[PDB]
Amino acid sequence: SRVAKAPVVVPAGVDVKINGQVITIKGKNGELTRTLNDAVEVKHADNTLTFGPRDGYADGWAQAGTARALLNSMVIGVTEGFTKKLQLVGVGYRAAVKGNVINLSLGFSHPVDHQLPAGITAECPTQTEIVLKGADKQVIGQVAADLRAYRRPEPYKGKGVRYADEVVRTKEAKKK
Amino acid sequence: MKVRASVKKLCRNCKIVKRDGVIRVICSAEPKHKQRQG
Amino acid sequence: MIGLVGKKVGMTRIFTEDGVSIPVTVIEVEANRVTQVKDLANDGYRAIQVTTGAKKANRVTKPEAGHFAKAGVEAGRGLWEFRLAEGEEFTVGQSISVELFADVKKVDVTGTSKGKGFAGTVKRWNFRTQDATHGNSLSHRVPGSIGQNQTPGKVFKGKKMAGQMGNERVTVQSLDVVRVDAERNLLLVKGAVPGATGSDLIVKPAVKA
Amino acid sequence: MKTFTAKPETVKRDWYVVDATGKTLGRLATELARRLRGKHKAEYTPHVDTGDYIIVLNADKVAVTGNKRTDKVYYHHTGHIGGIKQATFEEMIARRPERVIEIAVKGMLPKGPLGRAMFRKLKVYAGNEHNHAAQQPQVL
RNA sequence: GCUGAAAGCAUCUAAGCACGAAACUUGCCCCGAGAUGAGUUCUCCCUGACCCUUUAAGGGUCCUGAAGGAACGUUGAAGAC
RNA sequence: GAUGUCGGCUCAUCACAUCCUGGGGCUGAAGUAGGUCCCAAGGGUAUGGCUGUUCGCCAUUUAAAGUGGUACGCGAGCUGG
RNA sequence: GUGAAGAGGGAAACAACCCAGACCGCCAGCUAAGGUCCCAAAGUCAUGGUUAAGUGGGAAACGAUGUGGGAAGGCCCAGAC
Ligand SMILES: [Mg+2]
Ligand SMILES: [Mg+2]
Ligand SMILES: [Mg+2]
Ligand SMILES: [Mg+2]
Ligand SMILES: [Mg+2]
Ligand SMILES: [Mg+2]
Ligand SMILES: [Mg+2]
Ligand SMILES: [Mg+2]
Ligand SMILES: [Mg+2]
Numbered sequence: 001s002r003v004a005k006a007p008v009v010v011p012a013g014v015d016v017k018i019n020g021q022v023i024t025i026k027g028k029n030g031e032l033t034r035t036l037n038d039a040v041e042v043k044h045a046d047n048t049l050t051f052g053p054r055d056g057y058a059d060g061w062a063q064a065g066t067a068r069a070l071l072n073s074m075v076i077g078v079t080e081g082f083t084k085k086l087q088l089v090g091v092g093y094r095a096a097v098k099g100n101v102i103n104l105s106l107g108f109s110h111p112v113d114h115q116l117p118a119g120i121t122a123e124c125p126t127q128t129e130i131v132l133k134g135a136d137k138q139v140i141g142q143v144a145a146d147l148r149a150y151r152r153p154e155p156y157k158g159k160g161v162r163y164a165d166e167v168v169r170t171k172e173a174k175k176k
Numbered sequence: 177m178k179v180r181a182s183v184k185k186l187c188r189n190c191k192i193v194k195r196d197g198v199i200r201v202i203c204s205a206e207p208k209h210k211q212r213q214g
Numbered sequence: 215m216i217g218l219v220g221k222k223v224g225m226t227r228i229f230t231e232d233g234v235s236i237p238v239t240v241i242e243v244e245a246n247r248v249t250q251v252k253d254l255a256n257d258g259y260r261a262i263q264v265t266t267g268a269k270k271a272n273r274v275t276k277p278e279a280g281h282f283a284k285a286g287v288e289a290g291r292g293l294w295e296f297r298l299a300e301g302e303e304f305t306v307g308q309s310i311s312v313e314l315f316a317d318v319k320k321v322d323v324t325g326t327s328k329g330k331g332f333a334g335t336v337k338r339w340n341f342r343t344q345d346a347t348h349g350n351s352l353s354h355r356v357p358g359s360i361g362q363n364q365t366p367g368k369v370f371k372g373k374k375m376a377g378q379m380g381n382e383r384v385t386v387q388s389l390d391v392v393r394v395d396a397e398r399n400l401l402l403v404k405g406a407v408p409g410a411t412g413s414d415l416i417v418k419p420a421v422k423a
Numbered sequence: 424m425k426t427f428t429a430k431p432e433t434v435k436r437d438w439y440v441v442d443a444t445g446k447t448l449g450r451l452a453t454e455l456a457r458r459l460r461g462k463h464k465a466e467y468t469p470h471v472d473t474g475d476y477i478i479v480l481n482a483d484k485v486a487v488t489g490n491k492r493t494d495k496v497y498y499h500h501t502g503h504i505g506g507i508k509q510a511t512f513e514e515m516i517a518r519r520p521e522r523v524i525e526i527a528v529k530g531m532l533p534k535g536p537l538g539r540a541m542f543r544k545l546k547v548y549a550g551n552e553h554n555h556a557a558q559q560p561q562v563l
Numbered sequence: 564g565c566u567g568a569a570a571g572c573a574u575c576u577a578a579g580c581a582c583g584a585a586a587c588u589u590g591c592c593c594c595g596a597g598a599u600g601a602g603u604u605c606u607c608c609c610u611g612a613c614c615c616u617u618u619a620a621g622g623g624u625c626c627u628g629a630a631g632g633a634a635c636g637u638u639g640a641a642g643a644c
Numbered sequence: 645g646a647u648g649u650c651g652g653c654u655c656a657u658c659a660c661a662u663c664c665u666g667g668g669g670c671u672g673a674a675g676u677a678g679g680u681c682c683c684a685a686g687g688g689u690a691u692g693g694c695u696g697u698u699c700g701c702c703a704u705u706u707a708a709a710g711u712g713g714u715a716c717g718c719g720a721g722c723u724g725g
Numbered sequence: 726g727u728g729a730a731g732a733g734g735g736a737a738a739c740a741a742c743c744c745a746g747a748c749c750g751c752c753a754g755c756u757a758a759g760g761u762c763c764c765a766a767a768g769u770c771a772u773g774g775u776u777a778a779g780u781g782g783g784a785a786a787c788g789a790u791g792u793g794g795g796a797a798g799g800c801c802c803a804g805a806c
């Protein structure tokens with residue numbers, strides 16, 4: 001039509017497996033599974049994978065799109081190693097890591113330590129930068145925000161941990 | 177502001193106005209400006 | 215999770231100039247497990263304990279037989295705890311009067327409130343009154359009952375109609391303990407404590423937090 | 424004279440172990456109800472006692488309707504006013520799944536004495552083949 | 564808010580996930596197995612003879628009467644009784 | 645062939661279109677304080693002067709002094725202005 | 726036209742609305758209105774299609790890329806969205 005999804009290679013490391021519905025993948029990165037919906041019928045010839053809609057039911061066809069993509073990311077994650085980094089701006093704001101507990105000195109009375117789930121560590125190349133990186137893109141996303149969420153940037157200044165991309169310059173001029 | 181009924185949407189860059197019925201004119205991609213569901 | 219024995223009067227310990235300290239001094243002699251409830255059988259966890267031993271020459275047979283291990287011993291009451299790791303005693307294997315509470319923790323005295331007896335809506339709940347300018351019939355006493363009218367009057371089974379005050383439990387909750395006296399088992403608390411003379415009392419640990 | 428219907432005092436005690444350990448809810452209730460009153464009727468009659476013992480296993484499992492899993496309350500109202508009026512949803516049924524089903528199967532009874540002492544012929548049970556002691560001896 | 568289709572993008576929703584209030588369930592205190600769905604555990608006491616039936620239903624006599632309860636009395640920081 | 649009026653006292657019970665406190669969105673939101681809308685009924689939600697008043701105005705408090713239903717709640721419960 | 730001066734069945738309950746006018750008796754049949762999963766008599770009926778909101782089972786202006794169907798158009802394998 002103008003959209004769909006058909007490709008999903010299985011290079012080295014890509015040790016995909018299906019158990020009726022379940023799909024466990026392996027590789028240089030980690031062990032990620034993701035039992036899709038029920039109708040789902042994914043397989044694997046030698047390289048291309050393919051979702052399986054029990055039939056052309058409304059909530060059954062589109063269920064393919066969201067699927068042929070999720071697994072694909074599982075592959076793109078396991079082979080590349082996912083990264084995403086945010087930056088902290090504002091006086092006093094600092095950064096630090098000690099394995100998991102990424103101590104955070106933002107601007108409250110006492111600093112904190114966000115313990116990241118397993119599969120994604122983080123590194124502060126400086127007291128200003130934090131670069132998280134792991135396999136599963138899921139835990140990646142939530143923790144990406146779960147972190148910046150500790151202090152969302154405010155317009156008047158911009159201060160507050162922001163994704164290292166956020167267009168938000170600053171405010172609309174103040175007033176009263 | 178976040179309205180109750182429906183005040184259309186106006187502007188261009190406003191949200192696709194798609195979701196669970198969320199109109200509110202504003203035009204997102206206005207770092208500060210953000211008239212919407214609330 | 216701690217002995218339970220009767221109290222007796224209250225005092226003041228004046229040193230360093232508190233004197234505010236209003237000790238309850240509730241003696242807590244031996245406990246003795248007497249029974250150990252557990253998962254299988256007995257139902258839940260628990261762990262009975264009759265922290266007493268008052269000479270009870272005349273007692274009904276089943277209780278007189280309720281004891282069984284070494285010395286035997288007899289008391290009267292019979293409490294227990296729950297989760298922990300208490301012994302398998304009977305009225306043998308004394309517990310202690312010095313439960314583990316360190317020196318500065320808050321206890322939870324629990325006794326049975328005194329008994330006023332039948333009491334008006336004036337004493338039961340502080341909501342009552344009425345004036346003295348006229349109509350001496352419904353003087354400063356009788357209430358004006360359940361509102362409503364045509365709503366048949368399900369009376370909302372409460373308000374506070376006169377009724378005996380009860381002797382119901384109380385559990386003051388939270389009471390810093392001042393003294394204990396290892397061997398001269400007394401254990402003093404800070405005021406409060408329901409009941410009088412020498413009510414059973416319980417004195418729990420610190421669950422109030 | 425002519426002649427009745429014969430349903431003296433009857434006697435058809437049973438052990439039917441209606442597992443219903445899966446997706447069979449709602450409509451499923453009707454059978455537990457009808458089999459309580461005597462639908463095939465080997466001799467029975469809507470008016471005589473005997474719920475024809477049944478045993479619903481699991482119970483703690485039902486797909487429910489299409490969405491009454493997150494959206495349907497039960498509503499009980501205690502008694503002591505204070506307008507407490509208790510309300511609990513279905514997904515909120517984690518302390519005692521056994522309750523439901525038994526609740527549903529009810530009301531569909533004659534309502535009154537007969538149908539009242541006829542409900543117990545169900546046996547709740549929320550955990551498959553467990554404490555089948557309710558009638559461990561014989562079953563079906 | 565993440566992830567992500569329908570709608571190659573994008574999208575907090577359609578699958579799935581993450582937060583989130585004195586409200587809701589619980590936590591705390593009291594009542595609480597008449598919870599007739601009448602639950603549990605521990606301990607105590609009773610193991611003498613016959614008869615008539617319309618015989619498994621019993622009905623009845625003598626000898627026994629425990630554990631316990633109650634009754635009475637002295638009473639109570641318990642109580643209208 | 646009788647359903648006793650207004651206001652007060654006593655004692656209430658519910659709604660939510662929420663006054664205070666709790667959580668959010670936008671702001672012509674720097675902060676502090678606010679404006680408005682969403683959510684929220686757990687609990688809390690003034691003493692007096694004048695008047696029969698309800699209300700109101702005034703003095704002085706308060707986190708705040710909510711709107712409304714309940715025979716404009718409440719006389720086989722009080723009062724009788 | 727019905728009730729009044731009309732009973733029976735239906736609309737949960739319900740003089741007037743729908744069916745229908747009770748001379749008696751019957752443990753005998755077919756139907757009306759309305760209904761056939763349980764309460765509760767009888768299809769968990771069949772052939773096809775809609776809905777996914779418990780709509781059905783309360784309510785307008787107006788609002789919306791919800792989803793079904795039919796017809797006509799704008800750009801576009803000289804490559805559109
Ligand atoms: Mg008089
Ligand atoms: Mg009534
Ligand atoms: Mg009936
Ligand atoms: Mg509201
Ligand atoms: Mg005033
Ligand atoms: Mg009135
Ligand atoms: Mg009078
Ligand atoms: Mg007068
Ligand atoms: Mg007439």
Ligand SMILES: [Mg+2]
Nearest residue numbers: 754755756767
């Ligand atoms: Mg017929």
Ligand SMILES: [Mg+2]
Nearest residue numbers: 761765766767
């Ligand atoms: Mg039937």
Ligand SMILES: [Mg+2]
Nearest residue numbers: 779780781782
């Ligand atoms: Mg409806």
